[PDB]
Design a protein around this ligand. Structure first.
Ligand SMILES: CC(C)(C)NC(=O)[C@@H]1C[C@@H]2CCCC[C@@H]2CN1C[C@@H](O)[C@H](Cc1ccccc1)NC(=O)[C@H](CC(N)=O)NC(=O)c1ccc2ccccc2n1
Length: 326
């Protein structure tokens, strides 16, 4: 069982350190359950974002193996192109030998330039991995480096330390009650069916159900634009002249919970969860973002949600487990 500590950066980004190569070259990466590739910047990249982050240098590792397979990934925000290579990846105390990963060659645009972290470590299914690159957790399982085919995630609140990804285990001290298991509706993302979103026992979005993903790599709780506007209206949020969904810090205390029903079970978020506070600057924890799929538009249950619920991602089962944080 491997234990990867995560830094909680401003309750907005959670990343941990990994080593790549021999000897290990270190990188910070988002542990991202909404994607499946591992990549880091490399010395082959001249983009601005590569210039202000740690760069992998294959010529300094005795265990690197080149490939000629190319890689291209577009995220919600940010994108990269690169080349795949193999090396040993030290993650959560495990030596992940023979791990295929991306060496960036372009990282265009500005979001990544300002980001504290170097790269991304995807924890989703191989079906959404670009160039069909074996994801890290799949490689760990395939090599028998974890005995149970599952991992769990605790994300801390209030910028505290203690966030972790537990590779190959579940630690019950992080949660109250027993885990509620939710079947994966579509295997690619960790995608599940949301049954309803309610406030004061009135349904306010996702009438008749809707698809959602559990995504540690997304800060906010996102959903279709029109539905989110309604929610924002419902919690009394309004965009300021600077493009920021502002809310009076007094509402944290007046407002009711917003309840997510998942596999027939209620998962409330109190105002203190769905409203972000920073010394009398309070923004909405909801953000409108349209994510079209075959099935339907996706909701994203990001860090706003995950901070409240210890999450188990079970590949043996194809289930997500949830329970309220301790
Ligand atoms: C959703 C949003 C608020 C924009 N947040 C993010 O995107 C953060 C931003 C972070 C900083 C920069 C680098 C990426 C990380 C991780 N991501 C979360 C990350 O978990 C994100 C969640 C997501 C899923 C689907 C659609 C959009 C967004 N996943 C992704 O972005 C995955 C990555 C992949 N190729 O597998 N991308 C897609 O699934 C993707 C992107 C663009 C598309 C355009 C047309 C058709 C299909 C498309 N699919």
């Amino acid at each position: 069982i491997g234990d990867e500590p995560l830094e909680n950066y401003l309750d907005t980004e959670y990343f941990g350190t990994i080593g790549i190569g021999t000897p290990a070259q270190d990188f910070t990466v988002i542990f991202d359950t909404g994607s499946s590739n591992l990549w880091v910047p490399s010395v082959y990249c001249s983009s601005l974002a590569c210039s202000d982050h740690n760069q992998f240098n294959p010529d300094d590792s005795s265990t690197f193996e080149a490939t000629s397979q190319e890689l291209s990934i577009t995220y919600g925000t940010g994108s990269m192109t690169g080349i795949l290579g193999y090396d040993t990846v030290q993650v959560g105390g495990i030596s992940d030998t023979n791990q295929i990963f991306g060496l960036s060659e372009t990282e265009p645009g500005s979001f990544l330039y300002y980001a504290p972290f170097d790269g991304i470590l995807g924890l989703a299914y191989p079906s959404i991995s670009a160039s069909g690159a074996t994801p890290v957790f799949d490689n760990l399982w395939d090599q028998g480096l974890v005995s149970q085919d599952l991992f769990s995630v605790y994300l801390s609140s209030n910028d505290d330390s203690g966030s972790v990804v537990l590779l190959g285990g579940i630690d019950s001290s992080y949660y109250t009650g027993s885990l509620n298991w939710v079947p994966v509706s579509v295997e690619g993302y960790w995608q599940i069916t949301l049954d309803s979103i309610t406030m004061d026992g009135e349904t306010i979005a996702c009438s008749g159900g809707c698809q959602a993903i559990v995504d540690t790599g997304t800060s906010l709780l996102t959903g279709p634009t029109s539905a989110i506007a309604n929610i924002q209206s419902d919690i009394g949020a309004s965009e300021n002249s600077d493009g920021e969904m502002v809310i009076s810090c007094s509402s944290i205390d007046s407002l009711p919970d917003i309840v997510f029903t998942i596999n027939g079970v209620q998962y409330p978020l109190s105002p203190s969860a769905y409203i972000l506070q920073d010394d009398d600057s309070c923004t909405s924890g909801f953000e409108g973002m349209d994510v079209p799929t075959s099935s339907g538009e996706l909701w994203i249950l990001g860090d706003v949600f995950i901070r409240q619920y210890y999450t188990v991602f079970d590949r043996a089962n194809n289930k997500v487990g949830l329970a309220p944080v301790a």
